[PDB]
Structures are given as C-alpha cells and as structure tokens.
C-alpha cells in the first residue's frame, strides 16, 4: 500500500479541514497521490526507472545528445515517463480511472504534438497510456507495440486506502453543498 | 440487483460483439442502465413515482394547470424527476459516479436555466442532484432543503453486475486499441 | 424528366456563358433544379401537395389553428414539406445525394429545433429525410414510422438531363482554373 | 479493377456485419479503398511512385538533401503525393468525387500552409488536386501548370465494383435508421 | 446645403480643438451630420415623414395597432425610416458612401432579423438601402419593389461643406500620428 | 460603521484560518461586506428600501402590476436596487472602487439588456451606477438625470474597519505565495 | 493618368459584361488598378524602386544577407514596398481611401507582427502607411520618422479615369439588385 | 516623491483640458506614472538597474550570450525587469494595486510562456510580482525565493501627489457623464 507517512498526512488534513475549498484540494491531492502510487509500483513491475518530470526536450537530448536544445523544433510536453528501445521512443502516461475519457484526451494531445518531431528525428514515437481501473484492478494498455515488449505485466496493488480516505472526506463534508458542487 | 433479462441482454451483446464501435455502445448502455437502475431503487426508497421523461413544460402544467403551454417563457430541460411539496418545486437528477464532475455540469445548467421561471411563477426552484458513489455506495445530496424533507434515505443496492459486465467487455476488447481510445 | 421551359433555359445559359462565376451559378442552379425535380416527382408518387417555402410557424397555424402567431414560440425553419396524419406531424426534407452527410446535418438541426414545440403542442414531431441516390436511383428514408404509412413508394425517375447539362458545362469550363475551384 | 482479395474481404465484412456502426465503417472503408485504387492507377499514368500521406519534411529532404531537418521552419501536412521537376514542387492530392467541395477545402489548406516554405526555399509550390468524377469518369485537374507539364493524362478505370459492394451494404442495412443517419 | 449654425458650430469646434481624440470626434460627427442631412433631403424628395430613431417594436405598433407590445416576438433594431403602403413594410436605411460594403452589412442583418416577424404578421418586409455616392451624387437603391413605387427620385444636393470642413480638420491635425490612426 | 457582530465574526474567521484559500475567501467576503455596508448607508441617504439582487421581473410587476409575468418578454438581470418616479425607471447598482472599470462593465451590460423592455413598456430606463471611492470617500454617479432628481447626495462614511481587517489578514498570510496569487 | 491600353481593356470589359458577378469583378479590379497606379506614381515622386510583392523573408535577406532563410523566425507578410536607410527598415503600404479605417487595420497588423523580428535583428522597423484621399488628392502619412526623411512629397495625379469607368459600370448595372449588394 | 518636470506637466494638462477624452488620457497617464515611480523607487531600494522595455530575447542574449538571436525560440514578453543571480533568472513585474487581480493575470501569462525556454536553457525561471498596495503602502511579493535574497526591502514612499492630481481631475470632470464611464 501507500506509505504510512503519506496516509497520516492525509488523515491530518481531513481531520483539520473545516472549509469546502480545503476539502476539495484534499480530494484532488488524493487522486494525484493515487496516480503517483500506481506509477511507482508500475515502474517496479516493469523494471524501469521512475522518472521525475522530464520535459520532452530532455527526452530528445537523452536519446540524440548531438541535438541543439536551443534550436530544435520540439513539442512542449512533460510525460510521466519514456523508454527508448531498439530505436523506438515510447512516451508513457499513467492513469488511474474507471473510464478512458482522460486517456483519450492525453493520447490525442501527445499523438498530435509528436508527429512532426517523429518525422524530423526519423524515430517512431509510440504513445502509451497505461491505465489501471481502480475497482477491477485490471491493466488497460492501448499500445500493441508496447505490449509485445512487455506481454505479461502484473502490478498487484490496490487503492483501498485512497477509497477509505475519500470516503471519510465525503462523510465529514456530506452536508456542505459548497463542497459537494466544488470544481478543482 | 438488475433484472435477469437485462443482464442476459448485455451478456448476449458482449458475446456477439466483434468491433470496437459496438463494444463502446455497450459500455455506454451499461452506464445508462446503471443510472436507471439506481433511479428506480431510489424512487422506491423515497416512496415517489418513477417518472418517464417529463419535459419542464409538463412539470409546470402539472403544478400550475392554468398556465398556457403555448405562451409560457420556460426552459427546455428534461430532468430525471421532480416533486412539488409545500409550494416548493424540487427538480431531481440521478447520478451514479465516483466523482462530482458530471453533477456540477448538470447543477449549473439546471440552476441557471430555472432562475427566471422561478421568478415568473413565484415558486422557489430547488435543484437536487442525488448521486451514489458506486464503489462506496454512499449517497451524496447537495440540497439541504431536500435533506430536511428526507433526512434518512437508505438505498441498499450494489452495482456488482455492471462492474462484472464492464470488466468482461474490457477483457474481451483489451487488445483492441481502437476500443480502448474510443469516444462515446 | 425535366420539362421544356427549364431544360432549354439551362442550355441557353451554358451556351452564352464565358466566365467562371456565371458557370458556377449554373452548376449551383442545376443542383437546385434537380432537388426540386425530385421533390415534385416524389410528391406525385405520394399523392401529396408539393409545398413552396412554408415556414414552420405557418405549419402550426395550419394544424392547430387556435395558436396565436404573434406569440407562439416556434422554431425558425422552412422544411421542404410536411404531413399531419393521425395527430403525428412529419417534417419532410428532400435530398439528392450519394451520401448521407447532408442528411445528417439537416436531421440533427430539425430534430433539435423541434423538441420544445413538440412538448408545447403535445404533438410528436417526426423528422423524415427522403434521399434519392442519383446513381442507383434508390430511395433511402430514415423514418420507420413514415415508411409504415407509405410502405412501397416508387419514384421512377432519372437525372440524365442534369448529368448531360453538367458535362456540357465541364466541356466548356473544364480548363478554367477559376471554375474548377469556385465556391457555390 | 479492384484487387480480388480486397473485393472478397469487403464481401465477407458485409455478410458478417449485423450493426449499423459496423456497416457505416464498411461504407467509409469502401470510399477510402476507392480513393486509393484511383491513386494507384493515376500514379501509373503519371509515372510516379505510389505514395500516400508523405510527411512534408520528407519531401523537403528529398528535394534539398542539405536542409537540417531538426531546424527548418516548415508546415506539417501529409499530402498524397508530390513531384519535383525543373525546380517546381507539385504537391498532389487524389480525389474521387462528383463535386469540387472537398477539393476546394484541401486546396485552400495546402496553399495557405505552403506559402512561407515556398519563399524560404525559393521553390514555387503548386497545389494540384486531381479529381476523378466517379459517375462520368472524367479527370479534373485545377493546375494549368501541372497540365502543361504532362501529355494529356488518361486514367481509364471505373468504380462498378465499389458501387456493387455499396449496393449489397444498403440491401442489408437500408431500412436501419441508425445506419441511414450514421456519421463516419 | 447644410444649416448655417451647424456649419459654424463645426468650424468653431475645429478651431478650438488641440488634441487628437477631440479631432477624431469631430470627424465622426461630420459623417453623422452628412448622413442625417442626406436623410432629411431624401425624405423631402420622396415626400415622406423624416423619422427620429423608431425602434422596430414601435413600427409594428404603428402598422398593426392591435399587437400587444409586451408579448410580441420581434427584432430589436432601429432603422432610419420606414414606409407601410398597401400592406407592405419597407424598412429604410440611408447611406452616404462610395462603396456598397456598409450597405451589404446593414441589408444582411435587417433581412435576416425580419424574416420571422414577416411570417408572424403575414406582412412582406422589404429592406431598402438608399445610398448616395458622395462624389458622383448618384443614388443607388437595391430594392426593385421600392423603385417601382418611386421610379423617379431626384435629390439635388452636394456635400462640399462637409468635404471643406474635413479639409480644415486635416490641415490642423495632418501631422499628428495619433489622429491619423485614431479609431 | 460596520455592525459590531459582523466585525467580530470576521476577526474570528481570520484568527482561526490556516489555509490560503480560506484566507482569500475572507478577503472576498470583506469586499462584499464593504459593498453591502455602502449600499445600506446609501439607501438611507436616498430614502429607498434597501434591496440587493432584485429580479427584474419583480421590478416590472411593481411598476406595472397588470403585466402577465408568465408571458412578458423581459431581461434576466438582478440589480442592487431601483427607483420608479415620474414614469422613469432608474436601475441602480452600488460600487465601492477606486476606479471605474467594473462600473463600465455593469453599465454596458444593464444598458444593452434593458433597451428592448424600455421600448415595450414605453418607460425610459436609466442605468445609475453609484460608486464611492474608498480612499477619497467621494461619490461618483454617472447619471445626470438621477443627479437632477435628487438634492446633493451625501453618504459620509468610511471603510477604516474593512482596511483594518484586511491588514490583519495580510499580517497572517502575506508571506504565503498561494494566498498572494489566489484567485477569488 | 492611367495607361491607354489599360483604360481600353476596362471599357471593353464593361461593354461585354452582362452578369452581376462579372460586373463586380470589374469594380474590384478598378480599385486594385487605382491602388497600383497610385503606388507607381508615389514611387516616382519619392525616387524609390517600385516593388512587385516582396515577402518579408526576402526583405530580410536583402537587408541582412547573412541570415539563413531556412531557420529565421520571421513573419509572413507581403507589404507593398520597403526602404532600408541608415539601418532603419521602413515597411510601406499604399492606400487610396477617403477614411483611415483600412490604414488602421494594416498598421496594427504590420506593427504587431514585426516587433519580434525587429528585436531579433536589432533593427528598428517603422510601419509607414501612405494614403492618398482620392477626392482632395491630399497625402496622409502616419510616420513622422518617414516624413522627416521625405518632408516634401508631391504626387500630382488624379483618379478621374477610374471614377468615369466606375460610372459606366453603374450605368449598366445600376438596376441590378444582385450587383448593388454583391460582395 | 514625483519630481518637478513631471508633476508640473500633469497640473498643466489638467488645467487646460476641457474634454472627457483628454481627461481620461490624463487619468491613464497618471496611473502609468505611478507605476513607473514605484518601479524606480523599488530599484533604488534593491540597488538594481531600473530597465527600459528590455524584451525577453534581449534578456537571453545578456545572460547566455552564445545564443543566436535569429533562431532562439523565445517568448514574446517584455517584463518590467529581471535579475540573473546564482544561475536563477528572476523575471520581475511591478504592480501598484489594492488587489491581486492584475498580478495573477501577469503571473499566469509569464509563468506559462517561460516554461519551454527554461527547459531549453536549463535555467529555472522564477516569476516575481512585486506589488505595492498604495493605501497601506505595504509590499507584497509572491516569490519566497526572491525574498530569501532580499529579506527586508524598504520602499518608503507614498502616492499622495498622484491622489491629489486625480482629485483635481475629478473636481473638474466629476459631472461629465462621458468621463465617468470612459474606457482607458
Ligand atoms: Mn498520468
Ligand atoms: Mn441523471
Ligand atoms: Mn431538401
Ligand atoms: Mn486525397
Ligand atoms: Mn443609415
Ligand atoms: Mn453593486
Ligand atoms: Mn496597399
Ligand atoms: Mn508592471
């Protein structure tokens, strides 16, 4: 599961919270911690490095170190991760969601913003959304090419603590209309 | 749970499906059946009539039968249900979702589109989003006024069959990229 | 087929034209004439009145004649035709096209804009796009309900004269770059 | 005509299809197959290599191999084909349509987006839409300059097989409202 | 031509003006005054009432007094003038301009916004843009129906006073970039 | 000055606040309280009933009680107050600001949206923005017509308490970047 | 004034014209011809090279030949003309018009789109709109810097041929609604 | 305070003005002068150069002077000032305002537009809005990092002359309706 310190930090904020805007920031932070928790575990299952916000220009400098970062025409995105194997660049995004809606948004954006640079570099750029459905816990991966490389991916985890914390937050703020209808 | 005939219809479509576009229509139909299943059970818990697409103009004719449907300036919406009690009009929408995003959209639309007609009629119009989180199964109701009227609402149900069917669909179409990234 | 007064005017217009812009106006009028010719012939087959730009408001006054036209909230559309039969209002559009694209546009528009007036009048409003494919000459009608009323409709026509006039036009302007890319 | 394997795959798809959306997908695929058959036959008549979706940057590298693909400021378009001759770049698009509407849309986009790179390279860039009318089978080419380059271009083919497959499709789905009004 | 007082008021405004934004307001006012002058003279030529900003809803109440102005669904526009003759409503706009662009914009808007009220009243509504070219002094009117009604129109005026005033203004402010490019 | 209960509630909110977002909410609430205190004092000086957010339809029913509220075509605006006198309707908005920016925005909206109802009612509708500059304490009123109606209007108040509460808030949160850049 | 052949070509076009859309193309062409005539004469008055559609990237290569046209970040515009003098680039646009509206639109666009390339080259880029009022024949130029360079400009021309041609056109097509309101 | 040459010009402009549009130009210039006066005084307190419209591209050439200005992909902003200290680029904006609204706008804009150039240069870019509240005369700076470098900044000024000039202006144009609602 999630780290004890991390759980306790959430427990403390929820217990201290008295206002809708604070409660909504907790809701949002839980979802991001859940996402990052999956990312870490997924990367351990794949035996790849967990990466800390690598902008696309740095991905390119890593794989083609002769390029000039000051002049290259290159998209401005920061994916969760990437892998360069056998001269294919896999651009990886983690998702934790019961639906694909957020995945389609990310895929379309990344796909469209990377076609030109793929052509300029002569490097195929494969967009890989790795989503886990937090209820079923099944993995859903769009990219057949990526699945060829990793055909048997097992990430044995659950999100029971995020669900518990969220459930606690909504019980504590369940008669605050302002919280119930608050946007992120 | 869900009706056997309804489950079996879903089972049949999933088993016959071979194409991403069909699979996505099933995904969407499951979510609507889940929503309607909650609606029916909720209405039984509240001891109110389950209503079949009543346009707002018909809500007004029901509560103020002297009004002229041909001339009244009135919004064009069709809520899931409504209740007129003690000269308050409660406009009710069901939701089944782990998040409030769809609720905020519906609330803002209904709230904004009903202010003028509320003023024209001199009838307070209260917008009531009744959402059940399908994982926790807790009820979340924005309207304090509605909760005053129904303070102890119990809808003892679950969505295990919708989750099972969806899980089956995603397993069967789990190596179809087109399905995994398909929009409704 | 196309008559005498109309065929002859087209040939005369093609023969005297010398500019791309005049030519394209002919191309456009040919297409409007073809659509109108189909409409007339379809109406002879259905034995219904062929109508001349009757606005929706006039459709209401014909079939619910207590309505006050100064007030009624009615949509601002002018459909090719309409039938009111057994308290169902069918709104009719003619199309001559090898594809359904124009039909979907008209359907979505007419369907959306007639929902509210359907609720006010409590008359269901059925939107019927009647399309003829001018190559196969087969009829395609979306409305199952319309087709129950008129189960075998035979419109035995062809568009050979329109095709011939269009080849005359392209024989004369086929190497005029302005014509070839001129907008409607 | 159309490759025999390709004919047979369409016939099988039609025979095994049961849903409106799969039927529309077959319709759209028939149109793309028809475009591509035309493209293949046209390219034989033009004595150029059959290409589809060429990245514009690849074109620039072919015609000016000393350009640095990492830095050149160039548009992102993927035309069907191209020809570079006597220091003129002809950007070529295949169309199969009874009207010029889609041709105008392609031409306006490609022309607008290549003006700047034409100045930078000091290479005139001529946009050539080559359309065959599938009913008359006449070829219509906008560009005077392209037509002066070539001897009279003749592509003597027909689309009878595509018309026959489409007829089979409508024989099966022509009374399905969802098919009739299905969007691509 | 134009009134003596109106002229003097303009000449005095130009004389005391010292800033671009004031100068530009004068330039705008001269054009509105030109348009209104043309309007008054045209109305004299046609022997019709010169009208002062009538909103469409008041047009409707004039022509169809039984209409309830609280409930009628009607466009919000204010044409320069109108004429109701033989159960036809001519909506009239005056233009003073060397090109038709202004005209096309007013026509398209007035035509589009009046279709529905034409149907509701069962009154044909004809949109008439009467433009005078300030250089040639020729009259251009789009409407055949209106010209059949008035086949012989002579408005024998000129705009020399306006051109002259505009000249003084540009004599004083001609080297001020702020004025030359002021909206 | 400001009611003593209201002062004390602000002071308690400031003292018990710990988060940037709760702090910004207090800031926004101080501004609305300042607006409303001004409104209350101005209304005493104008000898009108203190109102806030009046539905425009209520105004019309007050000034023309024979209007049918169900059918009249009227705008949906909720001004701070209004005055009807000698058949002129003055629509009144309170502002507290050192500049006219928000005043122009309110005036343009209210003026544009009341032209049509002014014609229909045959009642001139004059938009009156009454702004007090919180630093100079001078009153600025756009409408000549409103100012001719009234003897010289004097509202001799100050906003020192609001300035003192704001200072307390910034003493506590002025080194919190999230507060400093927090949006309303 | 304008060339004899050019005149005849126009008069012949009006004579054989019989449709509104052809008539309108003539009206457009007359205005472009007027603008180009003014352009050529202005360039003779200023003793500068009359230029044929130079794109900004070619301007840059003229003035700074060391720039790599494949990589330079530069606006896509095509002004009527330019002048590079004492390491200042004057971007020039000709206008023939009675009002400044056209001018304000071209200025605002040219000014905005050239700021960044001015900084990158370290060259000041001045936008000069040279308008002649076709009625008064007075010249109006926004740019003080340009007028300091050329304080005495006389372009002694008129546009009577264009007005006359425009008159024939409106004589033949003056009762065609389609033409009067054609875009 | 404000000097002699500048104070005197303002008084002269106010004294000779007689039109709303001239008056508002004065109001606007007063506000620009006040902002510039604060900038100058702040820069004296920090002992840094007060800069005059230095474009971002020039900021790059000053601090990474190998950059080619003809090519660098750099944002098109002109901040009030900048410091480059210990390989951190601080981008500085002055504000004089009782609220943070204008500061949030500038922050979000400058932050967004500098992300990509930060990655290319591998220099973090810190956005610093320095706001003075002209009533309290307190300084509010969002950047914790900037405030570590300059831990006690004292800008001992007031805006009394600007306030006095603005009252002269309102004394003279306070009953001119055009002035009162005139836009910048
Ligand atoms: Mn992610
Ligand atoms: Mn619902
Ligand atoms: Mn039709
Ligand atoms: Mn193509
Ligand atoms: Mn007018
Ligand atoms: Mn207010
Ligand atoms: Mn020009
Ligand atoms: Mn600033």
UniProtKB/Swiss-Prot annotation, chains A, B, C, D, F, H:
<comment type="subunit">
    <text>Homomultimer. Interacts with the glycoprotein N; this interaction allows efficient polymerase packaging into virus particles. Interacts with nucleoprotein N.</text>
</comment>
<feature type="binding site">
    <location>
        <position position="80"/>
    </location>
    <ligand>
        <name>Mn(2+) 1</name>
    </ligand>
</feature>
<feature type="binding site">
    <location>
        <position position="93"/>
    </location>
    <ligand>
        <name>Mn(2+) 1</name>
    </ligand>
</feature>
<feature type="binding site">
    <location>
        <position position="53"/>
    </location>
    <ligand>
        <name>Mn(2+) 2</name>
    </ligand>
</feature>
<feature type="binding site">
    <location>
        <position position="94"/>
    </location>
    <ligand>
        <name>Mn(2+) 1</name>
    </ligand>
</feature>
<feature type="binding site">
    <location>
        <position position="35"/>
    </location>
    <ligand>
        <name>Mn(2+) 1</name>
    </ligand>
</feature>
<protein>
    <recommendedName>
        <fullName>RNA-directed RNA polymerase L</fullName>
    </recommendedName>
</protein>
<feature type="binding site">
    <location>
        <position position="80"/>
    </location>
    <ligand>
        <name>Mn(2+) 2</name>
    </ligand>
</feature>
<comment type="similarity">
    <text>Belongs to the Bunyavirales RNA polymerase family.</text>
</comment>
<comment type="function">
    <text>RNA-dependent RNA polymerase, which is responsible for the replication and transcription of the viral RNA genome using antigenomic RNA as an intermediate. During transcription, synthesizes subgenomic RNAs and assures their capping by a cap-snatching mechanism, which involves the endonuclease activity cleaving the host capped pre-mRNAs. These short capped RNAs are then used as primers for viral transcription. The 3'-end of subgenomic mRNAs molecules are not polyadenylated. During replication, the polymerase binds the 5' and 3' vRNA extremities at distinct sites.</text>
</comment>
<feature type="region of interest" description="Endonuclease">
    <location>
        <begin position="2"/>
        <end position="184"/>
    </location>
</feature>
